[PDB]
Design a protein around this ligand. Structure first.
Ligand code: ADP
Ligand code: ADP
Ligand code: FDM
Ligand code: FDM
Ligand code: MG
Ligand code: MG
Ligand code: MG
Lengths: 210, 210
């Protein structure tokens, strides 16, 4: 009956969202929690394959259409998310609706309001971690990628959108200094996550942006 | 330079949306207009096939996800719609965003506001025809179908949603008595359409619900 927590990891490019989400699930399970990992986009579904082809530049998709497919890709996982949480399983998610708004919101003539609407009503995270890293430190972690959106100019506009989203006080945002070592960042994230898991059993799962 | 008009046909089940859209395009072209037919859902695209499988009950899709796919299926045709209109081609469309809101809006716990958002900003129709028919007269036109949403209880909830949408004065709604003969309904629609085509060359294409 004691529900699991919904924990989201957001963050700048190469700050370590995927490395930290994997390590968090491993550590929680080793400490006796029931925890599982999710990511968005979830490329395994029918909509997920359309999204993967788009990000790889194997296909072009009209900007509004692709924004709605990224949102639909979250909604198709909502029945699973609510089932797992109600069963006491904590979910750790590598990117969520915040990345959806920030990446479309970085394109010309896309307001933050329009971008948020499709995701209104999704399961509300109990904890949103944002992994911060200065661009000099990110550069040492590798060269850009060949997927769509992998260029500094675009990443910088998405970052401004993320800062606008962080003003929303309906959400439990926590900043994480992702400039430290893999292990030191993990310990900071893990302690914040243990606290969130404990309190989530106290209030019902909320709805995002409503 | 004289743009074409965007004309939408909406209406109750079996009122004749598809019969009248076909006959309208044929008559406009015979009278010297450049006119072409479109329909939604457009089942030929990747998203269109997902939608067709859902309507045929060959697959189940989560309600929010399917609502966003119906909207994305309109946005993927926006570059074509704007190109055609700018080239002076009038477009006659069998269903549009109004059916999108009314059909999802008929399901439990779906507000009209949430349903409208994804379609905010689409090309705004210059003329929205709504084909009205009493349920007794519809029954004589055949038996229900085996596709999703083909049942009187659901169609009745969608009808209430359409009436809420008709209160919006930003749109040029025209009621059509679809109880007459195929030819008499066509003449009423055709005369309204000739008037709309003439004035559309006067004002820029608008944006829906904004
Ligand atoms: N704290 C860290 N210090 C040094 N390298 C890191 C750190 N976190 C991640 N990395 C490395 O940087 C790269 C990007 O990490 P990744 O977790 O894939 O980031 P994201 O998912 O945020 O793009 C990987 O090679 C990873 O091993
Ligand atoms: N005015 C009308 N009078 C009689 N039958 C009609 C009329 N309009 C359409 N029909 C018939 O009713 C059926 C439904 O028409 P259709 O155009 O497919 O409706 P919709 O697309 O609105 O469901 C078809 O068999 C069609 O021939
Ligand atoms: C969830 C989500 C991710 N992205 C983008 C962000 C990024 F460029 C890309 C691949 O994500 P990973 O970096 O996590 O591989 O997908 C979007 O553009 N919208 C979304 O809704
Ligand atoms: C455009 C549109 C149509 N429909 C529904 C309405 C109907 F039951 C179905 C098939 O449409 P046709 O009746 O025009 O075949 O699809 C929706 O549910 N949402 C939409 O956005
Ligand atoms: Mg990653
Ligand atoms: Mg039809
Ligand atoms: Mg609003």
């Amino acid at each position: 009956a004691r529900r699991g927590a919904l924990i989201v990891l957001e963050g700048v490019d190469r700050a370590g969202k995927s490395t930290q989400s994997r390590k968090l699930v491993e550590a929680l399970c080793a400490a006796g929690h029931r925890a599982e990992l999710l990511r968005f986009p979830e490329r395994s579904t029918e909509i997920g394959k359309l999204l993967s082809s788009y990000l790889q530049k194997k296909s072009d998709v009209e900007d509004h259409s692709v924004h709605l497919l990224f949102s639909a890709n979250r909604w198709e996982q909502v029945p699973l998310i609510k089932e797992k949480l109600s069963q006491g399983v904590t979910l750790v998610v590598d990117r969520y609706a915040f990345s959806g708004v920030a990446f479309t919101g970085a394109k010309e003539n896309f307001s933050l309001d329009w971008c948020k609407q499709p995701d209104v009503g999704l399961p509300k995270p109990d904890l949103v971690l944002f992994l911060q890293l200065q661009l000099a430190d990110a550069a040492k972690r590798g060269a850009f990628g060949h997927e769509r959106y992998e260029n500094g100019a675009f990443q910088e506009r998405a970052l401004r959108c993320f800062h606008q989203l962080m003003k929303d006080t309906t959400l439990n945002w926590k900043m994480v200094d992702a400039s430290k070592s893999i292990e030191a960042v993990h310990e900071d994230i893990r302690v914040l996550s243990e606290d969130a898991i404990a309190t989530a059993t106290e209030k019902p799962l909320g709805e995002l942006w409503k």
